[PDB]
């Protein structure tokens, strides 16, 4: 896979900082490119992290798997610390589309087996059922990456 | 700063910045010329279906979106009351935003 950590074994001091109101799940893509969950960060909290150069991270709502940003973009890979200075990862909400944001709220209020008992267009039921998925996001991101080459 | 008028189904007039209103793909098309010739570009859009409580909330989104998109300054949650969630979702879908 294009989307995976490099096994550089070169350490990199990192700060995860959650400037989202969500509980954040950091996700590490391993050497095979499979996502590994790491302990969650409460909203407003940060901590120092021992990672390595070339290692690939992304961030999600720990409850809903909603997608989040890190340094204004989707993936995080740290360079070598320059003379041992930590690398900052500023985790935030993205500006969701009003559609996606409304999907979030309705999901939070309705059991999935009741989606189809809402008085709405048939097309939105599918949209509601289409939960945010780390695996689906990776296929979307992988194709985007292949288009830069 | 050109403005435009968005009229709700119950006759409420919302005047918003044109660049803000363009957040909607549906509105961008309705304001922009017929097809590829950008002429007889209009200045009002009427929504026979969307009521005032929903179009007001939609316009708040356009402001939020412009202000916070591509912004280095930390981004807050866009708030939605349960009571408007279903109607707002249908608007959003209709408006492509």
């Amino acid at each position: 896979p294009v989307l995976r950590s490099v096994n550089s074994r070169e350490p990199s001091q990192v700060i995860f900082c959650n400037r989202s109101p969500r509980v954040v799940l950091p996700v590490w893509l391993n050497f095979d490119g499979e996502p590994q969950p790491y302990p969650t960060l409460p909203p407003g909290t940060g901590r120092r992290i021992h990672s390595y150069r070339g290692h690939l991270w992304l961030f999600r709502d720990a409850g809903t798997h909603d997608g989040l940003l890190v340094n204004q973009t989707e993936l995080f890979v740290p360079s070598l610390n320059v003379d041992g200075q930590p690398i900052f990862a500023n985790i935030t909400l993205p500006v969701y589309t009003l559609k996606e944001r409304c999907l979030q709220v309705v999901r939070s209020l309705v059991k999935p087996e009741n989606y189809r008992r809402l008085d709405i267009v048939r097309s939105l039921y599918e949209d509601l059922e289409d939960h945010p998925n780390v695996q689906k996001d990776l296929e979307r991101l992988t194709q985007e990456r292949i288009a830069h080459q | 700063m050109m403005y435009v008028k968005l009229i709700s189904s119950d006759g409420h007039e919302f005047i918003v910045k044109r660049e803000h209103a363009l957040t909607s793909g549906t509105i961008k098309a309705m304001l922009s010329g017929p097809g590829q010739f950008a002429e007889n570009e209009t200045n009002e859009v009427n929504f026979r279906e969307i009521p005032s409580h929903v179009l007001s909330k939609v316009c708040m989104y356009f402001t939020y979106k412009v202000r916070y998109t591509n912004s280095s300054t930390e981004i807050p949650e866009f708030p939605i009351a349960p009571e408007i969630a279903l109607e707002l979702l249908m608007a959003a879908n209709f408006l492509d935003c």
């Binding site: 074994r9 350490p11 302990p39 901590r47 120092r48 992290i49 021992h50 | -």
Partner: protein
């Protein structure tokens, strides 16, 4: 002071780029937050690293070479103590200690 200069030479070797592939976990003090270790400081009563040893040398804090060796051996012992024998960092610790023990042995 003759032999303390030699102790400084040993540390210099431990810091060298050739040993870096195994020496880097001991370069600086253990960062328990970074590493996510709730229990390190409970189990390890007296932590140690290469940087701390370097600074103690510069402060002429080591009475003799035996006291320098005891802190280098403490750094390693602490790693062996906290980790299981099959752990990767244990292998790296033993590989660096190999370097240390050889140099420390040849000291007039």
């Amino acid at each position: 002071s003759e032999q303390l200069k030699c102790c400084s030479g040993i540390l210099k070797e431990m810091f060298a780029k050739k040993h870096a592939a195994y020496a880097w976990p001991f370069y600086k003090p253990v960062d328990v937050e970074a590493l996510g270790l709730h229990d390190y400081c409970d189990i390890i009563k007296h932590p140690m690293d290469m940087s701390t040893i370097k600074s103690k040398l510069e402060a002429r804090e080591y009475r003799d070479a035996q006291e320098f060796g005891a802190d280098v051996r403490l750094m390693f012992s602490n790693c062996y103590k906290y980790n299981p024998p099959d752990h990767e960092v244990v292998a790296m610790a033993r590989k660096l200690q190999d370097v240390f023990e050889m140099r420390f042995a040849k000291m007039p």
